Amino acid sequence: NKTVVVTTILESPYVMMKKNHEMLEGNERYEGYCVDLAAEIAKHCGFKYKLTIVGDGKYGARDADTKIWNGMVGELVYGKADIAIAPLTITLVREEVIDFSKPFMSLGISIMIKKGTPIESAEDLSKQTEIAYGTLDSGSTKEFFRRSKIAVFDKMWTYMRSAEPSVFVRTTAEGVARVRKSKGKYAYLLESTMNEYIEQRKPCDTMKVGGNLDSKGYGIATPKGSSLGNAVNLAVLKLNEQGLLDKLKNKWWYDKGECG
Amino acid sequence: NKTVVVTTILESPYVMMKKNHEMLEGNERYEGYCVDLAAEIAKHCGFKYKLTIVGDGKYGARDADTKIWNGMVGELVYGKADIAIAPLTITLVREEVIDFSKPFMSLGISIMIKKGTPIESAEDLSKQTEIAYGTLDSGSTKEFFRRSKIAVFDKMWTYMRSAEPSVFVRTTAEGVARVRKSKGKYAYLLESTMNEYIEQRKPCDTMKVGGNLDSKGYGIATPKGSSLGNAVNLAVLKLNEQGLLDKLKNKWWYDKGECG
Ligand SMILES: N[C@@H](Cn1cc(F)c(=O)[nH]c1=O)C(=O)O
Numbered sequence: 055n056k057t058v059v060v061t062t063i064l065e066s067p068y069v070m071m072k073k074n075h076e077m078l079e080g081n082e083r084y085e086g087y088c089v090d091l092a093a094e095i096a097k098h099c100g101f102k103y104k105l106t107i108v109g110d111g112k113y114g115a116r117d118a119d120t121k122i123w124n125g126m127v128g129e130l131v132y133g134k135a136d137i138a139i140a141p142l143t144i145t146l147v148r149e150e151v152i153d154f155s156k157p158f159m160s161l162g163i164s165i166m167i168k169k170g171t172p173i174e175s176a177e178d179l180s181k182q183t184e185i186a187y188g189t190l191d192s193g194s195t196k197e198f199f200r201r202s203k204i205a206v207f208d209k210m211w212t213y214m215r216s217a218e219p220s221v222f223v224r225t226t227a228e229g230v231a232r233v234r235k236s237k238g239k240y241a242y243l244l245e246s247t248m249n250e251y252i253e254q255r256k257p258c259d260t261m262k263v264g265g266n267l268d269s270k271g272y273g274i275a276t277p278k279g280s281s282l283g284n285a286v287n288l289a290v291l292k293l294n295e296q297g298l299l300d301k302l303k304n305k306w307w308y309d310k311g312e313c314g
Numbered sequence: 315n316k317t318v319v320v321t322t323i324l325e326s327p328y329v330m331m332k333k334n335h336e337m338l339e340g341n342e343r344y345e346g347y348c349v350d351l352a353a354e355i356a357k358h359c360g361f362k363y364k365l366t367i368v369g370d371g372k373y374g375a376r377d378a379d380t381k382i383w384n385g386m387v388g389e390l391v392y393g394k395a396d397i398a399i400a401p402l403t404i405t406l407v408r409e410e411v412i413d414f415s416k417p418f419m420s421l422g423i424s425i426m427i428k429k430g431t432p433i434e435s436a437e438d439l440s441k442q443t444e445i446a447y448g449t450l451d452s453g454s455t456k457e458f459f460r461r462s463k464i465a466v467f468d469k470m471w472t473y474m475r476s477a478e479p480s481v482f483v484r485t486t487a488e489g490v491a492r493v494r495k496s497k498g499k500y501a502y503l504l505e506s507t508m509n510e511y512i513e514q515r516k517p518c519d520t521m522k523v524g525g526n527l528d529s530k531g532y533g534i535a536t537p538k539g540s541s542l543g544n545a546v547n548l549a550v551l552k553l554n555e556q557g558l559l560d561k562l563k564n565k566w567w568y569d570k571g572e573c574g
């Protein structure tokens with residue numbers, strides 16, 4: 055057997071650099087939900103692995119011109135990594151080029167506001183212009199709006215794509231910082247999982263409002279045809295049935311929440 | 315190509331006999347969420363199909379002695395059906411013998427009470443003996459309790475397995491009838507999806523209480539190695555992304571709710 059190369063992404067609380075990572079090496083440098091999940095998956099599948107952070111820091115999109123896949127999806131497609139264990143959304147376009155395990159976490163697009171912002175829904179956002187709003191500049195959330203045929207979401211996309219200055223951000227942390235520093239004049243559309251995590255982090259000035267706009271899941275990905283796919287899929291189901299996934303979410307989201 | 319034999323189960327509001335089914339034939343005899351889903355899946359995969367109701371009316375379990383699979387899972391395993399489109403829970407033991415598409419619906423085990431019953435959680439149920447409680451006599455809900463290592467659920471299982479008279483029911487309708495006629499002395503543990511549906515049906519005397527005990531999903535199943543598996547999986551993802559699955563749930567659960 056050969057050491058399995060795992061690609062993942064620095065996104066809290068899935069994968070984060072330990073405070074004393076400098077005095078550590080290898081897999082011990084990282085911590086988080088996906089770090090713990092990788093260990094469990096490897097144990098149940100019987101393989102040794104090496105955690106690596108995706109080179110370009112992206113999730114995975116295909117350039118329409120070059121037809122090249124970037125991010126974690128690209129690392130799997132081109133053979134740079136053997137498996138991706140991260141908050142990677144299971145989508146049709148990705149499923150066509152890589153394999154996904156059954157979902158290990160459920161989520162949906164949601165709204166994050168600075169406390170006090172007079173917004174309760176996506177409809178509210180679409181009907182006004184005072185408060186700007188956007189999404190991560192790349193990823194399944196942005197694609198949801200770009201492709202949506204639903205009236206409200208179509209209206210939101212039409213506004214966001216031409217908004218000036220840009221309402222799109224490079225990372226979740228940037229979106230959160232923008233919400234926190236815009237005095238309620240910026241609302242952020244992001245995956246509910248990240249939203250829920252941030253709501254329990256100091257300075258406790260943000261909140262998730264309304265229901266989710268959609269429902270989907272994160273899955274563990276492997277190059278299509280990979281001999282690891284079957285075992286990884288069964289391991290995810292086993293971990294869910296044993297309640298381990300629920301335990302891990304509580305560990306990284308709520309057990310040490312900072313907002314009471 | 316050959317007509318695809320679809321196996322499903324009579325479970326409201328997934329598959330139900332039309333009021334005037336007697337004057338109809340073939341697939342037109344049935345209606346419901348899964349009937350509509352089957353039509354969408356068939357359209358997107360390009361196949362003609364025949365809806366059939368599982369012979370033994372079961373979901374799918376393996377007899378420990380004969381090693382024989384019953385229910386819809388069995389029909390796929392033994393080649394009696396080509397695909398199962400129903401509220402079939404994706405589980406490890408089943409995934410080992412048949413293939414499952416990514417989930418088309420999310421759910422979790424939940425508690426159904428007759429309005430007014432002094433119960434708010436699974437913990438509440440486990441700490442008392444006045445109110446009896448049980449599950450469907452076979453299926454993923456019962457297995458959840460039988461296998462759970464979680465204190466509260468283990469305590470509940472220990473009670474349910476030896477309770478007299480039996481707290482297990484043959485069908486969802488039986489569990490609901492038992493809740494409605496037991497004057498609050500019987501609480502029913504069932505999948506949240508069914509619970510949510512019943513709560514919006516007359517006589518509007520039941521209610522879902524507390525959060526779900528777990529989180530999982532329903533998937534479309536095919537015999538392992540089936541040439542239909544890949545297309546069906548992509549179709550589920552496409553239908554979810556296009557918002558069709560959400561539309562179908564609203565259609566069969568809430569659009570015509572009978573409880574205001
Ligand atoms: N999980 C997404 C990436 N991703 C992450 C986020 F935190 C978010 O808010 N939106 C998003 O699309 C993907 O796989 O593209």
Ligand SMILES: N[C@@H](Cn1cc(F)c(=O)[nH]c1=O)C(=O)O
Binds near residue numbers: 452456
């Ligand atoms: N979906 C389950 C069957 N099933 C159905 C129910 F309505 C319920 O409450 N519990 C259950 O296990 C399976 O696939 O076994």
